[PDB]
Amino acid sequence: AWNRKRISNCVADYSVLYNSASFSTFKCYGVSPTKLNDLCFTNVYADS
Amino acid sequence: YSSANNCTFEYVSQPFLMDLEGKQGNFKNLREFVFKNIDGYFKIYSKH
């Protein structure tokens, strides 16, 4: 019963993910997670 | 309305104020709007 959320018309970042976060596994498919900044998505969902 | 099932965009514009007077009379003001949709992005224009 995961939670589906909506990220719309705002700005994300990647540099605020790993500075002392030290999470278990961070990875991305079809694009390097390092360059999340330059890429530009549309209608980002959030499932947790 | 009844309720809202889902909502891909929500929004509040800039603050401004209203007269809120029921007194009878000729229209002392004027308002114009041009609603339009181009290439998937909504827009609006106005003048007082």
Q: What does the alpha-carbon distance between residue B25 and residue B22 come to, in Å, rounded to a whole number? A: 9
Method in brief: cryo-EM
CB contact under 8 A, B7 and A6: yes
User: For chain A, which residues lie within 8 Å of any Cβ of chain B, measuring from their own Cβ?
Assistant: 6, 8-9, 43
Tell me how close the Cα of A20 comes to any Cα of chain B, in angstroms: 32
3-class DSSP state for residue B43?
strand
3-class DSSP state for residue A40?
coil
Residues with Cβ within 8 Å of residue B46, at least 6 apart in sequence = B31, B32, B33, B34
Residues with Cβ within 8 Å of residue A13, at least 6 apart in sequence = A36, A37
Task: Resolution in Å, one decimal, please.
Answer: 4.2
